[PDB]
Each structure stands twice: as C-alpha cells, then as structure tokens.
C-alpha cells in the first residue's frame, strides 16, 4: 500500500536525469553548512525539534521596553565606509596582518560592544537563563542602557557583576556600587532579587535590595525602600541566580504597601512577585537595565543565617531516584546468584524463629 | 544434491520497541543487520549494531539529516558525489527522558 506525502519531498526539486550537468559540492564543510541549514526548517514529518523541547516553538514575544535608538543608516554606513578606507590605507596594518603580530584594545572593543550589540546579547543570555520566564513569563525586554555593578571587597579589590557571572557571597556581603549614564531628567528604580531560594514557595522570589526614585546616576541619594541583605543560598542546592533590574519611571511614585522596615529580617515579609509588582505600576516603570549573576554556598552564608536571620541553617542533598528493578520471579531462569541481592532489603542475616 | 547448506534459522533481527513504549536504561530498542535504524539521542550502539536505550523514557522514531563522520572514507566520498540540492535523510531512534535527573531534599537542619 502507498500513501500520498503531505507536502514536498526533500530531494524532489533537483532533476534525476543528466547528472553531469548538475553542479556538485565537493566540500564536506559545504555539506555541513547545507545540512545545518536544512535541519532548521519546520518539516511536516516528525522531527527532533518537535519532540525534544523547543519551548513552544514560535512564540509571540510581548516587548516591554525602551524604544531603540534612531540612528541614520546612510550616514552610519558612509562613516563606517570612510573609517574602513582610512584603515586599509595604512601599510603598517598590512605588515601587522601579514607577520601574524597584531593586538586589539579589548577595553575599547568591550566599550563599543556595550554601546552597540551588548543589549541584544544580554537579552539572549537572559532568554537562555530564563530570566524572562520566571519574572515576566512571555514578556521580554532589551537591556538598552549600560549597567555596571561592582562589589568592594577591600581597599582596592573590586569584583564586577556582569551578565551570567559567578560571585561568592564573601564578595557580596556588602552593598554594591551601580554605574550607568543618565542625565538629571529621569527617575530610576534599582531592584536586586533572588529568583530561586524561597523556602516555602517555589513560584516566589526574594528581595535582596530595592532603592527607588534615584536622581540620575546617584544611587545613594535615592529614597531607600528595602535594605540590602547578603546572599544566602542553601548548602546543598547551589547556584542561585541574583538579578539587578533597573526601571525608568516618569513620575515620582511613593509606595505605602511596598515599604519595608529598617532591620527587616523576616523572610515572610521578604516575599516578592515581580510580575504582580510590575502589574501594580506598569504605567510608570519601563525596564531598561539588567545584570544577573550566579551564586553558590560558602562559609559566609552561615553567619547570615545564624546571626542575622536567627536561623538553624538548612542543608540539602542531591538525591537521585532509586534504580529500577523488575517484578521478582519465583523461579528465575539463567540469572546470576547476585539476582537475590538486588531484592534483598538489608545486608544483615535475619532469623525469623531461631 | 548440488546446493547444500541452505538451512539456517533466522537471527530474529527486527524492531523491538515502538513509539510510545516506555523503556528503562539498557533495554534493547532494536537489533539490525546493516544500518537500518540509526541511533539518535539517548540511544547507544553496541558492536553488533544493536540500539539500546541509554535513559529511561519514551521511544520516538524520527527522520533527520545524515552528516557522517569525516574519518569514514566511503561515506564522505558519497557526500562528495551528491549534487548541490541533495541532502541525505535517514531515520533515527530517540528516547525522551521522563524522570528528572534528581531532586533536592532537606536532610539536616543545623
């Protein structure tokens, strides 16, 4: 029995006859490019992409963010072209390219990266790490403004926090500095939150820092809502993610329900829903900045648990499921003597009546 | 007479598990003589070309592209002789994982 295909065959486009006239690729790299291009198309048959978790496939991404900067394309292209011509005009550039000895100022490369495509790259890191999924669900934003977080360890030691970094709580015991470029015409809101680490509720998150109504760059002069608290992961479950979010707000908004007290060590009080909090004040705030880091357990977590929060410190463990065994048969056929050891309860000789 | 040795029983080569069947780690999903079903995700390969499940879960059968090993000379020569619009397609056996890797349990509060 033969059935009709539901759509086109993959190789039915090319002609079977006159094989010599058809051009061939002679490169395995050309096949690698062609096959990786072919594997990304939505075929009508059953695919790996359908079965192995493509995360709903095509998704209509709701954008809650700042407008992209309007830059004149023709002027940008001509200034890039003229810079390139003046770059190829030099002979010492040819010498350094030929003799395999040339270096680039990676600090200036990083600065131009932060100005140009750093927002889109940090957006795709946040999409990969699931920052949008557990904060705004299907909603996403482009981190338009540059944002720098740094932790002062001592006199000169300063530990940065970039996207997806890894910072030990010994570095993060004290309050960080935050640097971003803004004029004095806007209002800002900085919020450090721990997405995973809530004990009772799996869908809720912790506030570790919150400052609101920031005049421009100056974070300190802004009104202080929630106190800074050192990172406290569990000893067993490591790598909790801590996210700094920066929101641009137009009007001066004061909270009477979101205000937290001065010591404020109660984790029942420190219970957050960033989705509902942005639902409360959607009209004022628009998210513009984001920087997040991973954080595991160290010895400095113990003092935060004991002295600050008055805790007995919980310790977790990564427990795998027990191995599968079939139903035990009365007469196993062609099986080793250790087959009884799979179903033995404990390795202790027990005597029922003796 | 003239023809001898024609008596030989079958080796029972064929498909064992279908799509939708729940298997555990180590279950042989299919056995084959030449490469009829290729191993995919979470499916191992033994030296007699049998396909065995590496993880516990649900078996799937799938059609994808064939990008062979560059050390395999006949395969890469077959790649070289294909025309530019042609791509190889083969079938694959996968096991989607059902159980998670593990869980975190509170063992002691100190």
């Amino acid at each position: 029995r033969r059935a009709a295909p539901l759509g086109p065959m993959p190789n039915e486009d090319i002609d079977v006859s006159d094989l010599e006239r058809l051009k061939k690729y002679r490169s395995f790299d050309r096949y690698r490019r062609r096959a990786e291009q072919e594997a990304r198309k939505p075929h009508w048959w059953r695919t790996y992409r359908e079965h192995f978790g493509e995360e709903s496939g095509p998704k209509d991404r709701v954008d809650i963010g700042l407008p992209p900067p309007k830059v004149s394309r023709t002027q940008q292209l001509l200034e890039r072209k003229q810079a390139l011509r003046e770059l190829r005009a030099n002979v010492e550039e040819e010498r350094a390219a030929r003799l395999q000895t040339a270096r680039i100022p990676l600090e200036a490369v990083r600065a131009e990266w932060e100005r140009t495509c750093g927002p889109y790259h940090k957006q795709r890191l946040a999409e990969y790490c699931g920052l949008y999924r557990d904060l705004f669900h299907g909603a996403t934003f482009v981190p338009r403004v540059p944002l720098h977080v740094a932790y002062a360890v001592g006199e000169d030691d300063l530990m940065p926090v970039y996207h997806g970094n890894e910072v030990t709580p010994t570095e993060a015991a004290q309050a960080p500095e935050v640097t971003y470029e803004a004029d004095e015409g806007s209002l800002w809101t900085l919020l450090l939150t721990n997405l995973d680490g809530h004990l009772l509720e799996p869908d809720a998150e912790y506030v570790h820092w919150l400052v609101t109504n920031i005049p421009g760059n100056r974070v300190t002069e802004g009104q202080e809502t929630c106190p800074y608290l050192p990172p406290f992961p569990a000893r067993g479950s490591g790598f909790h993610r801590f996210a700094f979010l920066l929101f641009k707000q137009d009007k001066r908004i004061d909270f009477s329900g979101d205000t937290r007290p001065s010591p404020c060590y109660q984790l029942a009080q420190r219970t957050f829903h960033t989705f509902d909090f942005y639902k409360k004040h959607q009209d004022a705030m628009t998210p513009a900045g984001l920087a997040f880091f991973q954080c595991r357990w160290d010895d400095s977590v113990t003092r935060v648990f004991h002295q600050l929060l008055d805790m007995r410190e919980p310790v977790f463990e990564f427990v795998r499921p027990p191995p599968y065994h079939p139903k035990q048969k009365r007469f196993p056929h062609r099986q080793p003597l250790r087959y009884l050891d799979r179903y033995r309860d404990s390795h202790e000789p027990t005597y029922g009546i003796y | 007479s003239k023809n001898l040795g024609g008596k030989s029983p079958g080796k029972r080569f064929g498909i064992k598990k279908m799509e939708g069947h729940y298997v555990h780690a180590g279950n042989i999903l299919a056995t084959q003589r030449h490469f009829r079903w290729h191993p995919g995700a979470h499916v191992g390969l033994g030296k007699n070309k049998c396909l065995y499940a590496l993880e516990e879960g649900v078996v799937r059968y799938t059609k994808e592209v064939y990008v062979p090993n560059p050390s395999n000379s006949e395969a890469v020569d077959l790649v070289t002789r294909l025309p530019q619009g042609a791509v190889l397609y083969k079938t694959f056996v996968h096991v989607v994982p059902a159980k998670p890797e593990g869980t975190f349990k509170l063992v002691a509060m100190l």
Partner: peptide
C-alpha cells in the same frame, strides 16, 4: 515504511551513479 507518506525520504542511489560516438 511502505504505507507511510514519508516513504523514500532516504532515497539517494538515484542521485549518484556508480556501476563513444
């Protein structure tokens, strides 16, 4: 399989041949 609509998706020998006036 024969009865499936995805029959002959692995057909390759018609594209490569390997076997004057």
């Amino acid at each position: 399989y024969r009865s499936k609509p995805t029959h002959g998706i692995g057909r390759y020998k018609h594209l490569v041949k390997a076997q004057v006036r």
